[PDB]
Amino acid sequence: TRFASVYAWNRKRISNCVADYSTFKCYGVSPTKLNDLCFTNVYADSFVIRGDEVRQIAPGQTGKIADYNYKLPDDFTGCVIAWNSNNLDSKVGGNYNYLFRLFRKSNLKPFERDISTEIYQAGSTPCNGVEGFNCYFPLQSYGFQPTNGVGYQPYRVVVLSFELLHAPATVCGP
Amino acid sequence: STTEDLAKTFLEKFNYEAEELSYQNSLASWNYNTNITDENIQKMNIAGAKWSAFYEEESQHAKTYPLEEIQDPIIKRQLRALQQSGSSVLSADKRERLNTILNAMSTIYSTGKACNPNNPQECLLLEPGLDDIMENSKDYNERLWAWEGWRSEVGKQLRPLYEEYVALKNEMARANNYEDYGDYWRGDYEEEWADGYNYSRNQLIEDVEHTFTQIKPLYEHLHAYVRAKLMDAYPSRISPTGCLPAHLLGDMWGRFWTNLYPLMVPFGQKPNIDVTDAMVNQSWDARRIFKEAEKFFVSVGLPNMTEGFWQNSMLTEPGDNRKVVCHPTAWDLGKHDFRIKMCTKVTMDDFLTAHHEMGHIQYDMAYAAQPFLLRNGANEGFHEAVGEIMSLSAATPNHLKNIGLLPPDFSEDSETDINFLLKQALTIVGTLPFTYMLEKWRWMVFKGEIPKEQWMQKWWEMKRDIVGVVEPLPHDETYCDPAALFHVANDYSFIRYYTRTIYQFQFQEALCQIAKHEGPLYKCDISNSREAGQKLHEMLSLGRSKPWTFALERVVGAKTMDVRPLLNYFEPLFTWLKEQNRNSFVGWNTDWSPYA
Amino acid sequence: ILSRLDPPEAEVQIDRLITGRLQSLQTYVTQQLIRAAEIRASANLAAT
Numbered sequence: 132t133r134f135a136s137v138y139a140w141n142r143k144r145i146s147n148c149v150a151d152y153s154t155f156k157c158y159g160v161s162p163t164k165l166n167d168l169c170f171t172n173v174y175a176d177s178f179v180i181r182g183d184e185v186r187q188i189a190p191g192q193t194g195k196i197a198d199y200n201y202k203l204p205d206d207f208t209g210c211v212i213a214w215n216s217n218n219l220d221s222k223v224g225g226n227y228n229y230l231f232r233l234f235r236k237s238n239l240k241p242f243e244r245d246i247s248t249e250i251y252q253a254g255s256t257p258c259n260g261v262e263g264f265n266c267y268f269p270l271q272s273y274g275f276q277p278t279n280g281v282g283y284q285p286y287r288v289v290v291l292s293f294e295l296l297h298a299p300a301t302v303c304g305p
Numbered sequence: 306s307t308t309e310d311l312a313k314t315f316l317e318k319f320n321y322e323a324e325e326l327s328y329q330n331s332l333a334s335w336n337y338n339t340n341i342t343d344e345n346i347q348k349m350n351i352a353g354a355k356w357s358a359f360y361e362e363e364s365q366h367a368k369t370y371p372l373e374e375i376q377d378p379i380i381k382r383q384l385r386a387l388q389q390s391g392s393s394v395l396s397a398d399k400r401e402r403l404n405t406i407l408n409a410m411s412t413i414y415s416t417g418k419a420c421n422p423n424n425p426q427e428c429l430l431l432e433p434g435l436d437d438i439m440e441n442s443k444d445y446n447e448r449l450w451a452w453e454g455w456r457s458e459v460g461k462q463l464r465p466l467y468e469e470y471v472a473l474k475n476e477m478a479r480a481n482n483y484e485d486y487g488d489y490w491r492g493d494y495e496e497e498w499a500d501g502y503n504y505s506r507n508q509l510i511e512d513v514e515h516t517f518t519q520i521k522p523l524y525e526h527l528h529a530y531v532r533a534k535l536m537d538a539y540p541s542r543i544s545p546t547g548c549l550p551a552h553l554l555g556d557m558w559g560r561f562w563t564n565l566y567p568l569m570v571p572f573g574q575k576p577n578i579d580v581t582d583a584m585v586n587q588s589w590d591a592r593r594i595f596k597e598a599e600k601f602f603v604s605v606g607l608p609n610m611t612e613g614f615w616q617n618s619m620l621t622e623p624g625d626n627r628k629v630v631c632h633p634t635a636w637d638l639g640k641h642d643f644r645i646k647m648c649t650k651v652t653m654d655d656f657l658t659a660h661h662e663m664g665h666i667q668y669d670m671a672y673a674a675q676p677f678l679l680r681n682g683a684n685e686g687f688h689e690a691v692g693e694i695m696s697l698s699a700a701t702p703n704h705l706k707n708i709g710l711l712p713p714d715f716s717e718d719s720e721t722d723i724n725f726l727l728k729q730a731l732t733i734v735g736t737l738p739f740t741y742m743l744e745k746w747r748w749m750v751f752k753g754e755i756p757k758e759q760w761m762q763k764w765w766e767m768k769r770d771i772v773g774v775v776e777p778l779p780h781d782e783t784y785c786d787p788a789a790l791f792h793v794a795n796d797y798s799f800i801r802y803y804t805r806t807i808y809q810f811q812f813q814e815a816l817c818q819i820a821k822h823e824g825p826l827y828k829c830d831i832s833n834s835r836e837a838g839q840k841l842h843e844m845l846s847l848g849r850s851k852p853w854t855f856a857l858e859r860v861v862g863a864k865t866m867d868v869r870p871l872l873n874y875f876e877p878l879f880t881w882l883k884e885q886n887r888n889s890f891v892g893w894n895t896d897w898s899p900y901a
Numbered sequence: 902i903l904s905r906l907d908p909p910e911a912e913v914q915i916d917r918l919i920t921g922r923l924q925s926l927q928t929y930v931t932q933q934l935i936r937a938a939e940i941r942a943s944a945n946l947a948a949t
Contacts, residue, residue, distance in 0.1 A: 160905060161904070161905055167904065
């Protein structure tokens, strides 16, 4: 239901244990075989997010998200399951509970944490407790009316890679 | 930082707050049409109170931008529109006067009416019977006393708190919240630029005069033959230069000869290819018009009404405790999925409105889906007649014969040729004049030139002469009924129809034979013309650097409106027209007159 | 290589391999060939 965010990317270390454990889309490293690829140890980049920006989940992006929160590296390669989550996360009361940041202060690489949560001014205002005249807060809420289409509506967002990792994998046969 | 960057963080939050809040307002309105309450009035109670506030305080709170050093169109216009303010334009006491004006008979204009004292028996509702008379009405003293009646009672039911609103705002209007009444609008059509980019001021108006001043014979004998019919039904007296009242045929409209149509049906003996009878020969219906007429008119693929919407939609006029009307209503949200809902009874006219109401949205997006406030249109005469105009434009007879309606009966044999052929001609012509002069008054009505002072004598004599044109009793200035116009109340101007109709004829012309169709010069074509689609993206509509000429037109069409293939259509007209309308004479000599 | 990355750039990798061995083995035989010339002159002198 809730996910560790892009900064909170979690070691749900889904590996190293004996292997006794929905439309598909394909971009990256050789897909059409299962055992050989390397899933080694997983910090999990996974959250329910917008679906419009799946083209910005791709090499070489530019836009609001790419400029001020996150962009995806030009070497993002992977074949995943592009499928919606309408019936699950298309609410009816109006849902602002999911928080998206508006601007980013440092050019960062993927895969770490930044929790700057001070009362964040984006303008010249010395915001002495009175909002306005270019005053802001770091994180911004979403808002989800009874009818959010696939764009802001979350897919169950498997728009991922099977990223190439370092350690021995854990998927094999006989 | 810049206008774009400051307004851009502003709009990343302001699309959200304004879109979202007026969005809650729209959803609340829908919940209202589910169920009625006061909570439902400003929410439709909290949200309409919140939204009217919200916009005025948006003015108050982002009213902070100048204009002077601007040499560029989008920045200039954007910043003037931004500096346009609500609840906050001028000084304290006069704007408090203004806000009470606006809200106070923004309410009482709906709340106002009265009754009749003549016969002390009853005063109750009046709508239906006179509307049946509207549909079948040709009667004499009815015409006369009915115009007198209704444009005599509207007066003092408007005048009390619209006295406050329109009248008191009208003396300030003689100082109209701007400068006033003449050149400060006679100095605006020359767009704020110089030497290469911006508009002219006279070409369209001069060709309009050259058109009408000799289109008049079309009035002559078209209105001569529908005058034979209109005076075998209507009042009492025949000569060439007369005098008629209009208003209640039961109520206002009585507009066109296409409105006088039902005595004069399209095809007499063989059933017309007419959507009821001919498309029930073709097995097509009304609930089926929604679904099976997605199929039956827009087999090209109407956008789906969204699924849960289809489920919840009690689509017709509810007739239950819910009091709603699906007189075309539209819903549109955006939010990174391209979604549009509309109430539409898809006919073939409605085909054309499906196509270019997506197109009318395409216009809107061009001023409503660009960067949030860079969403600017082409010109001011371009907003709802954009739907009406290129509906009439998208009329495509033998393209929809490839879809299967019109046979090639466009022939010439005297009597039923008169009927069929001049009836399509009847529609394609129509008429200009008092709309013309009223819109001219609006343009020449923004700096100040209107005399006020010497009230009784000047206004009496001015008033008599200015009204002049007959109504059984005057509906008029000094006995102040006239300023009740819906086109001033809700601001739906008609020169909009005009400029887009010029656009219509040219671009339509190359729309239904020249993308290489089968037949004549009327017939315009786009058949299998993705290439037409890009050359629409391509050679009129981008801006005013090299203009409205440059990014759709000079391929889809060209500038002015003409009647040339319509002249191959309409030469029978002018000849027959000349030959017999001698019982209607230019101007008025006051001696000969049918209606006098 | 052939499991993961195809020969759009394995064709250039085999091209650079064959050309780098053109220089390096043509020069294997080339300095070994100038060496053969020197050793053959030496053998002629030794026999004389």
